[PDB]
Amino acid sequence: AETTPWGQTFVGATVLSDSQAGNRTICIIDSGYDRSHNDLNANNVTGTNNSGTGNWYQPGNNNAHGTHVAGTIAAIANNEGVVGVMPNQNANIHIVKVFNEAGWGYSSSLVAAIDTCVNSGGANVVTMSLGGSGSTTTERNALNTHYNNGVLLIAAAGNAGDSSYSYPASYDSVMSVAAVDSNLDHAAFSQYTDQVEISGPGEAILSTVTVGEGRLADITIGGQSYFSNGVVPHNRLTPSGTSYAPAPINASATGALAECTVNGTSFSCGNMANKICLVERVGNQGSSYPEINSTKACKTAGAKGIIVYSNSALPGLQNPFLVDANSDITVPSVSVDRATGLALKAKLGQSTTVSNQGNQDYEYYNGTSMATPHVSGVATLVWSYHPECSASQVRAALNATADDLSVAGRDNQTGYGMINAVAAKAYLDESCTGP
Numbered sequence: 290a291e292t293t294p295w296g297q298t299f300v301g302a303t304v305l306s307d308s309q310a311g312n313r314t315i316c317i318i319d320s321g322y323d324r325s326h327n328d329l330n331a332n333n334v335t336g337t338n339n340s341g342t343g344n345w346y347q348p349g350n351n352n353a354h355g356t357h358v359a360g361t362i363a364a365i366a367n368n369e370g371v372v373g374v375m376p377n378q379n380a381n382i383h384i385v386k387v388f389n390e391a392g393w394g395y396s397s398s399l400v401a402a403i404d405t406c407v408n409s410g411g412a413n414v415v416t417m418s419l420g421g422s423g424s425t426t427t428e429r430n431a432l433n434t435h436y437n438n439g440v441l442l443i444a445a446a447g448n449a450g451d452s453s454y455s456y457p458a459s460y461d462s463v464m465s466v467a468a469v470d471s472n473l474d475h476a477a478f479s480q481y482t483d484q485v486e487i488s489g490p491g492e493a494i495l496s497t498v499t500v501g502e503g504r505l506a507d508i509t510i511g512g513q514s515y516f517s518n519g520v521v522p523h524n525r526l527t528p529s530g531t532s533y534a535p536a537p538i539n540a541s542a543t544g545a546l547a548e549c550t551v552n553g554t555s556f557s558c559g560n561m562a563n564k565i566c567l568v569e570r571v572g573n574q575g576s577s578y579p580e581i582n583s584t585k586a587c588k589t590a591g592a593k594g595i596i597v598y599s600n601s602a603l604p605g606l607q608n609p610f611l612v613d614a615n616s617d618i619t620v621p622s623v624s625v626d627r628a629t630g631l632a633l634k635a636k637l638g639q640s641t642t643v644s645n646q647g648n649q650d651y652e653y654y655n656g657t658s659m660a661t662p663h664v665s666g667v668a669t670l671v672w673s674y675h676p677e678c679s680a681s682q683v684r685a686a687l688n689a690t691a692d693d694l695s696v697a698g699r700d701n702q703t704g705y706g707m708i709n710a711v712a713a714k715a716y717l718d719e720s721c722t723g724p
């Protein structure tokens with residue numbers, strides 16, 4: 290079975306065809322590409338090794354970021370796993386690995402990595418789900434040169450949750466990408482600046498990760514699965530000395546579905562013993578991490594399994610941190626969007642199985658770094674229909690056809706809005722400058 294993550298559908302990539310993507314080349318500057326992965330092995334992917342990061346096709350351990358990014362761009366269509374923006378093995382992908390498990394390990398600069406993308410990879414699009422706080426004239430000039438030479442540069446705005454500029458995203462020659470969730474709401478962590486240019490799916494993004502390093506969840510009732518609806522295993526964290534460390538609960542639980550009603554700020558769970566506890570999320574991640582509140586409400590009641598669904602404030606699919614100070618949540622708990630939670634209440638009383646599974650080959654990630662590949666992936670796809678147009682023209686098309694979000698007009702949170710592949714393509718169909 291193959292799933293189409295919400296982001297793929299929202300950007301409109303599923304209705305277009307990448308049959309011509311072979312005339313485009315997108316270079317991913319990141320932590321490598323797990324070429325051994327079933328959903329990535331057979332892509333038209335190449336790479337340029339660097340003395341400091343080993344093989345581009347071997348991310349190593351706990352260095353799956355680049356693989357997740359690559360999966361969003363080109364996870365292969367094959368009835369298993371997921372699908373990326375261009376899943377039919379047409380697009381040319383070049384990999385430049387600048388990150389090792391320990392961190393940046395490239396023998397040279399970011400400018401050098403981009404040079405390699407262009408000179409060695411023949412890249413038309415360079416996607417960078419990375420960022421730093423510093424900026425320089427040499428770098429600004431080098432990237433402006435590549436841009437004017439016809440290379441489209443795209444980067445992540447950052448997840449610091451403030452107005453700071455992250456580079457290269459904040460240079461004028463680069464598209465700064467913001468993150469929004471499945472309800473098109475601005476991601477609380479997404480940095481907001483006057484450089485933010487466009488938005489892409491960046492909360493609860495399912496994609497490929499280094500084989501065996503992922504994690505998934507599922508909800509089954511009447512022999513049917515809610516997996517395709519989006520079920521996120523709780524990113525549980527428990528105390529570990531001077532901080533918190535991941536303490537995932539990977540197990541399965543089965544029992545009659547029962548909901549803990551939320552009245553004001555109080556819970557009416559009753560006796561959840563031997564049952565799967567459905568509960569609406571109280572509060573939302575931002576200045577704090579309240580996931581534990583609704584979650585513990587269920588647990589305290591004796592629930593064997595817990596299903597937390599989004600509230601009306603943030604109805605989209607959330608993948609929040611489950612900060613468990615007392616390490617109380619020792620049962621499998623998951624997160625689903627509001628629509629899914631409301632559909633589940635119709636099944637109350639029925640036998641339900643909730644499960645969190647470790648050692649998987651896919652996983653849900655959050656980040657402007659996840660929104661970025663949606664944008665660069667769509668940019669490459671749309672560009673393949675009109676390779677004659679310049680990078681600046683393609684960039685203009687994406688901006689001119691993005692779906693305005695939040696307050697009317699361009700804003701620092703979402704830029705011009707949610708990228709729209711179909712509209713962008715239609716734009717260039719008229720001419721390289723649109724209608």
Ligand SMILES: [Ca+2]
Pocket residue numbers: 291328364365366367368369370371372
């Ligand atoms: Ca697949």
Ligand SMILES: [Ca+2]
Pocket residue numbers: 457458459460461462463464465484
């Ligand atoms: Ca910029």
Ligand SMILES: [Ca+2]
Pocket residue numbers: 693694695696697698699700703704705706
């Ligand atoms: Ca707006």
